[PDB]
Amino acid sequence: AGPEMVRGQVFDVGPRYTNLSYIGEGAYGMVCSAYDNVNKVRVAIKKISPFEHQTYCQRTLREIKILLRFRHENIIGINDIIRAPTIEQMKDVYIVQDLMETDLYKLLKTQHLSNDHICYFLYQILRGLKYIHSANVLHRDLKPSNLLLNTTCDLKICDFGLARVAATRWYRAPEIMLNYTKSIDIWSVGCILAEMLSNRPIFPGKHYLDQLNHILGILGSPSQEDLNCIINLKARNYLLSLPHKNKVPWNRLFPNADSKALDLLDKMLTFNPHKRIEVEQALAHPYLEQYYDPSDEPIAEAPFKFDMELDDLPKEKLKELIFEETARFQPG
Ligand SMILES: CC[C@@H](CO)Nc1ncc(C)c(-c2c[nH]c(C(=O)N[C@H](CO)c3cccc(Cl)c3)c2)n1
Numbered sequence: 001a002g003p004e005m006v007r008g009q010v011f012d013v014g015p016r017y018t019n020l021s022y023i024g025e026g027a028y029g030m031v032c033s034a035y036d037n038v039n040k041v042r043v044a045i046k047k048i049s050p051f052e053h054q055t056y057c058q059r060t061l062r063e064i065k066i067l068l069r070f071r072h073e074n075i076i077g078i079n080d081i082i083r084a085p086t087i088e089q090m091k092d093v094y095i096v097q098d099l100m101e102t103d104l105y106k107l108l109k110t111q112h113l114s115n116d117h118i119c120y121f122l123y124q125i126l127r128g129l130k131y132i133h134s135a136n137v138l139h140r141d142l143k144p145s146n147l148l149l150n151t152t153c154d155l156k157i158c159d160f161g162l163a164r165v166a167a168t169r170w171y172r173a174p175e176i177m178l179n180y181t182k183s184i185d186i187w188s189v190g191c192i193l194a195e196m197l198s199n200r201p202i203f204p205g206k207h208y209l210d211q212l213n214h215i216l217g218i219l220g221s222p223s224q225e226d227l228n229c230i231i232n233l234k235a236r237n238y239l240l241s242l243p244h245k246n247k248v249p250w251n252r253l254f255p256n257a258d259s260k261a262l263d264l265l266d267k268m269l270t271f272n273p274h275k276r277i278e279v280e281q282a283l284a285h286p287y288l289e290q291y292y293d294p295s296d297e298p299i300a301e302a303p304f305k306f307d308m309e310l311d312d313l314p315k316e317k318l319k320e321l322i323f324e325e326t327a328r329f330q331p332g
Pocket residue numbers: 023024025026027028029030031044046047048076097098099100101102103106145146148158159161
């Protein structure tokens with residue numbers, strides 16, 4: 001028969017993984033659903049081709065090392081890894097993960113969420129983020145397409161490509177554009193909460209400049225303290241040259257939303273990251289009272305730390321480290 005192919009891209013994952021079907025894609029790869037003849041279940045296989053670029057090699061090694069170390073109910077894990085038996089032949093890496101029914105991007109495209117469903121989804125994102133942040137790791141790309149869901153509404157965070165030890169424009173914090181920290185992930189969670197409440201993105205900017213205008217159009221003009229930071233000159237002089245913009249109240253933008261949901265949203269969507277609410281205070285907020293449970297909210301045993309500076313290593317050395325990291329999944 002030979003190896004299977006999906007939309008041009010070859011998928012040399014057999015004979016264990018057969019009956020392949022397209023489910024998603026990325027900047028340097030493809031995601032496919034496949035049947036596992038060992039566990040007798042369908043799984044998700046993430047193919048990635050990162051060896052042509054040094055940045056992609058860093059992301060691949062960071063993603064593999066983080067997900068293998070991490071073990072949480074609201075975070076996607078790695079079940080198996082397939083790659084060529086020799087380093088010279090390795091051009092692709094296949095990460096086998098648990099298959100989920102849908103994601104929040106697909107769900108908000110077709111379904112209207114009840115307050116209890118918005119409350120339960122937000123809790124699981126923050127429960128998962130509590131574990132990521134306890135390990136001193138930043139996701140840096142939290143969005144509805146990276147939040148996977150199953151039949152029984154169980155949520156899982158995926159795509160740890162941009163993850164780092166302490167992105168999509170619409171869920172990007174103003175400090176990334178103005179000038180990184182745990183607070184940039186909370187901003188993204190705020191953007192996700194607002195999208196669950198209206199089935200529309202709160203800041204759908206077409207470019208980095210239009211993105212800042214959409215934020216100022218709701219939050220109002222920034223104060224002297226909000227601008228008093230290590231901000232870039234171009235962005236600082238641009239925001240100062242703009243006319244005065246009034247703050248739109250949260251109850252006016254979301255008329256029939258829960259008052260507690262809007263109080264937490266305000267604390268998550270705060271321009272100043274220092275004044276922005278943290279993952280623990282967000283979980284203890286009265287909006288997530290019926291789900292908050294410090295007893296069943298695990299944290300990472302120790303903070304994450306890389307043994308070597310990956311930014312200084314060339315793509316040739318990073319390829320060797322990727323080959324060595326994926327070796328324990330090879331037969332023998
Ligand atoms: C069938 C429904 C889909 C989600 O809608 N199910 C599902 N189930 C499990 C998983 C692990 C996934 C899944 C979703 N995105 C990804 C995933 O890893 N996506 C990133 C881009 O966001 C990616 C993909 C390929 C290459 C690169 Cl460089 C990066 C995995 N998707």
